[PDB]
Design a protein around this nucleic acid. Structure first.
Ligand code: CL
Ligand code: NA
Ligand code: NA
Ligand code: NA
Ligand code: NA
Lengths: 216, 460
DNA sequence: GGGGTTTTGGGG
DNA sequence: GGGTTTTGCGG
DNA sequence: GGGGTTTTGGGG
C-alpha cells in the first residue's frame, strides 16, 4: 500500500499512458498539502514528496476573490486544500524544469484551492523531489522503454544483418563505428519523440506573473 | 606551529590550537543558510581512539571537528576513512561530554588532508601518483606549508593509522544500524555495507545495490559527481541515511545533501572482513524474472574474470567518438553496459546459421545441414544511459564464427529448426533481454567498424 | 592582533 | 555541532 | 578597506 498520495497518483498516470480518466477514481478526492515554498518556485508536499502545482488563470482569480486578504506567493509554510484538480502529461526540457525527468513531466492542474490559513500539520520526513525518486524515475524509464520498443519494432525491419564476411576475414578491412547507428524511429530531430500518449494542453500561469499581480 | 595531541589539548585556554589526526567519519560539506557551509567530522589519534574497555565492548572513542566556511570549496571532502587531516587555529570546548574542536576557515583557520595510503581517492580514480608523502592532496586557502619537523609527525601518525585500522573495527557496531532493522529507526541512521552493484540509472545518477552483514539488500541513488569513488565489491560507510517508506517494489535508502559515502583505507580490518564475509546476492533479480514489470534492474550477464580490471565505455563514445578521440582509437577491445531494445533476426530459429569458412558466407538451416559449421549470427540493437534521449539504437553483434561470444547463451550453436531444447532456451533468453530493466554488461572487440561480443555469458 | 592587501593610517 | 541549500542531478 | 573579532585604535 502506497503512502505517498502524490507518488501513487503520478505513477498511475504514467502507467496509464497519461490517460487521467483511466486512473483510479477513489484518488480524485481533495488534496490537503503543506506548502514548502512559494517563490521563486511554488512547491507543495503530501508528507513524503514535493511537487509543483500549476494554477490556471481561473484558479488564481477564484482564490484572490474568495480570499482578498491572502497572497499566494506568501503561502510558504502554510497548508492549502485543492478541491478541484487534474493530472496531465506534458513534454518538457528536463534541463530547465527540475520537477521533471527524461524530458517528461506529470502536471498537477489546480482549478480551485482554498488556503486553510494557520493549520499546523503533523511532523513528517523532509520532502524530496518526486522526480528524483528511484522508483518513480524507473517508472518513467519503463514508459519510455515501452514507447521506444514499439517505435523500433515498427521502424526497424527486414533483418538487415551485417554480412558475416565484413567481420570475419577482415584483416585488410577498416570501418567506421557510426555504421552501427540505427534510427529508432521516424523522429524529426536528434531526440526520440515517437510517443503515443496525447500531450495534455491547458493554459497555465507562471509563478512569476502572479508575483507581479500581487506586488508588481 | 606547535601540534598538540587530541587528549592533551587545553580545554581552558580557549586559544587557537593545532593538531594532526585521523578522520574516521565526516559529513559532506553542506550549506545551512544563504551564506554558511559546514562539515562535521570524527577524528582520532594515539591518545584518543577507544572507549574505556571492560564494558565498553571495544567501542571507539573520538573527538569531533566542526569546520565553518562561507564557500563550499573551502571545506574538505572526505571520501575515505583513515586518511589524515592537519588543522590550524582550532578552538576546543566540551559539547555534551565530548571534546569538540571548532575551526572557522572563513576567518583564520585552515586544514590540510594527507593520504594515509599511497594514493588519495582522487588519485586512484585517475591512476595518478602522489607528489610526495609530505604533499597534501587537498587543503584550504591558496597555500599550504609543511615544515621539516612535521614529517616525523605525519609519517608516524600514518603508521599508527594502519595499525589502528588493521587491529580494530574503527567503525564499531554502535556507529551504524543493520539494514534489516532500518525500518525501525525514527530518523536517519548510518550504514556499513558492501557495494554489490553500481547501476547507471541516468546521465548523473548511480543506483548502488548494497548488502550488509545482516544479509539485507538495499538500493540507493548516488550522484556521479558527488561520489565518483563508488566501486562494486568495495565496502563503504554511509553517513546519514533514511528508510524510504514510499517504496514498496524495492528496499530504498534516502540520502541528503549532507549524507556521505566513505570507503576505507587498504589496511581496514572491517572492510577486509566484510569484502569476504558478504557475498553477492541475486535473490532480488531471480525474483524479478517472474514479474511482468520489474522496477529492479537486472544485469543478465557477467564478463570474463580477466576483464574485471577494465574500465567501461559508454555507447556515446563507442559509436560517436571511437573514430575521433585519440585514446579510443588506440583501443580495439572495450567493455560496456546497455539494454537490448530489439534482436535480429526476429525469428529466433534463424539465430543459428550454417557457415562456410571458404566463402565467408552463412545461410539458413531451414533446408538441412548442407550449409556448414553452425554459428551464431545475432544482431543486438541496444541503447544506454549516455544515449538514452537521442533517436538512435546501436548495433552490437554476436557472430561466433571465430569463437568470440560462442558461450553467450550457455547454449552451443545448433540447428534451432530441429533442436527444440536449444530453441526454447534461446527463446526464453530473447524475452529476458528485451524486457524492461534487463541490462547487459559485456566486453566487445572492434572489427571493421563493428563491435562483437566476447568473453561474456548470461547468468540467468 | 593580525591577513592580505595597499588601505600604507584608520571603520564598524 | 547528528545537519536541510539552489548550484533545484556535489552543495 | 573591510572580516572577523574584540584589538573597540592601530602593525607591518
Ligand atoms: Cl575498424
Ligand atoms: Na587592517
Ligand atoms: Na592594511
Ligand atoms: Na582591523
Ligand atoms: Na577590529
Amino acid at each position: 500500500q502506497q503512502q505517498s498520495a502524490f507518488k501513487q497518483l503520478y505513477t498511475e498516470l504514467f502507467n496509464n499512458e497519461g490517460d487521467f480518466s483511466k486512473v483510479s477514481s477513489n484518488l480524485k478526492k481533495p488534496l490537503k498539502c503543506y506548502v514548502k515554498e512559494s517563490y521563486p518556485h511554488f512547491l507543495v508536499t503530501d508528507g513524503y514528496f514535493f511537487v509543483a502545482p500549476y494554477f490556471t488563470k481561473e484558479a488564481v482569480n477564484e482564490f484572490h476573490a474568495k480570499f482578498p486578504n491572502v497572497n499566494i506567493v506568501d503561502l510558504t509554510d502554510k497548508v492549502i486544500v485543492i478541491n478541484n484538480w487534474s493530472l496531465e502529461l506534458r513534454r518538457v526540457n528536463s534541463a530547465e524544469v527540475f520537477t521533471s525527468y527524461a524530458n517528461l513531466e506529470a502536471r498537477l492542474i489546480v482549478h480551485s484551492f482554498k488556503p486553510n490559513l494557520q493549520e499546523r500539520l503533523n511532523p513528517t520526513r523532509y520532502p524530496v523531489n518526486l522526480f528524483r525518486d528511484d522508483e518513480f524515475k524507473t517508472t518513467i524509464q519503463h514508459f519510455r522503454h515501452t514507447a521506444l520498443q514499439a517505435a523500433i519494432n515498427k521502424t526497424v525491419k527486414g533483418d538487415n544483418l551485417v554480412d558475416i564476411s565484413k567481420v570475419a576475414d577482415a584483416a585488410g578491412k577498416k570501418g567506421k563505428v557510426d555504421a552501427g547507428i540505427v534510427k529508432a524511429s521516424a523522429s524529426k530531430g536528434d531526440e526520440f519523440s515517437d510517443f503515443s500518449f496525447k500531450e495534455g494542453n491547458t493554459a497555465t500561469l507562471k509563478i512569476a506573473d502572479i508575483f507581479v499581480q500581487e506586488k508588481g | 606551529y606547535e601540534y598538540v595531541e587530541l587528549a592533551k589539548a587545553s580545554l581552558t585556554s580557549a586559544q587557537p590550537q593545532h593538531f594532526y589526526a585521523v578522520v574516521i567519519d565526516a559529513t559532506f560539506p553542506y550549506k545551512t543558510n544563504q551564506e554558511r557551509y559546514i562539515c562535521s567530522l570524527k577524528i582520532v589519534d594515539p591518545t584518543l581512539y577507544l572507549k574505556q574497555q571492560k564494558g565498553a565492548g571495544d567501542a571507539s572513542d573520538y573527538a569531533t571537528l566542526v569546520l565553518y566556511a562561507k564557500r563550499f570549496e573551502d571545506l574538505p571532502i572526505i571520501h575515505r576513512a583513515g586518511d589524515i587531516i592537519r588543522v590550524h587555529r582550532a578552538t576546543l570546548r566540551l559539547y555534551n561530554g565530548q571534546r569538540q574542536f571548532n575551526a572557522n576557515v572563513f576567518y583564520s583557520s585552515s586544514w590540510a588532508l594527507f593520504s594515509t595510503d599511497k594514493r588519495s581517492v582522487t588519485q586512484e580514480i585517475n591512476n595518478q601518483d602522489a607528489v610526495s608523502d609530505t604533499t597534501p592532496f587537498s587543503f584550504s586557502s591558496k597555500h599550504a606549508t609543511i615544515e621539516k619537523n612535521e614529517i616525523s609527525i605525519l609519517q608516524n601518525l600514518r603508521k599508527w593509522a594502519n595499525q589502528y585500522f588493521s587491529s580494530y573495527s574503527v567503525i564499531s557496531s554502535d556507529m551504524y544500524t543493520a539494514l534489516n532493522k532500518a525500518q525501525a529507526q525514527k530518523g536517519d541512521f548510518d550504514v556499513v555495507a558492501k557495494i554489490l552493484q553500481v547501476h547507471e540509472l541516468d546521465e548523473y545518477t548511480n543506483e548502488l545495490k548494497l548488502k550488509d552483514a545482516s544479509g539485507q539488500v538495499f538500493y540507493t541513488l548516488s550522484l556521479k559527481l558527488k561520489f565518483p569513488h563508488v566501486r562494486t565489491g568495495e565496502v563503504v560507510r554511509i553517513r546519514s541515511a533514511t528508510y524510504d517508506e514510499t517504496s514498496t517494489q524495492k528496499k530504498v535508502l534516502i540520502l541528503s545533501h549532507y549524507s556521505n559515502i566513505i570507503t576505507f583505507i587498504q589496511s581496514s580490518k572491517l572492510a577486509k572482513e566484510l569484502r569476504a564475509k558478504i557475498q553477492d546476492d541475486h535473490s532480488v533479480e531471480v525474483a524479478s524474472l517472474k514479474k511482468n514489470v520489474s522496477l529492479n534492474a537486472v544485469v543478465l550477464t557477467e564478463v570474463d574474470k580477466k576483464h574485471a580490471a577494465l574500465p567501461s565505455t559508454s555507447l556515446q563514445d563507442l559509436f560517436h567518438h571511437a573514430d575521433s578521440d585519440k585514446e579510443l582509437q588506440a583501443q580495439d577491445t572495450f567493455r560496456t553496459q546497455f539494454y537490448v531494445t530489439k534482436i535480429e533476426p526476429s525469428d529466433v530459429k534463424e539465430w543459428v546459421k550454417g557457415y562456410d569458412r571458404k566463402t565467408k558466407k552463412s545461410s539458413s538451416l531451414k533446408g538441412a545441414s548442407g550449409k556448414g559449421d553452425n554459428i551464431f549470427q545475432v544482431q543486438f540493437l541496444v541503447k544506454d544511459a549516455s544515449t538514452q534521449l537521442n533517436n538512435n539504437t546501436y548495433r552490437v553483434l554476436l557472430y561466433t564464427q571465430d569463437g568470440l561470444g560462442a558461450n553467450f547463451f550457455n547454449v552451443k550453436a545448433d540447428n534451432l529448426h530441429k533442436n527444440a531444447d536449444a530453441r526454447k532456451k534461446l527463446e526464453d533468453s530473447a524475452e529476458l533481454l528485451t524486457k524492461f530493466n534487463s541490462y547487459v554488461d559485456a566486453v566487445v572487440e572492434r572489427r571493421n567498424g563493428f563491435y562483437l561480443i566476447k568473453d561474456t555469458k548470461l547468468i540467468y
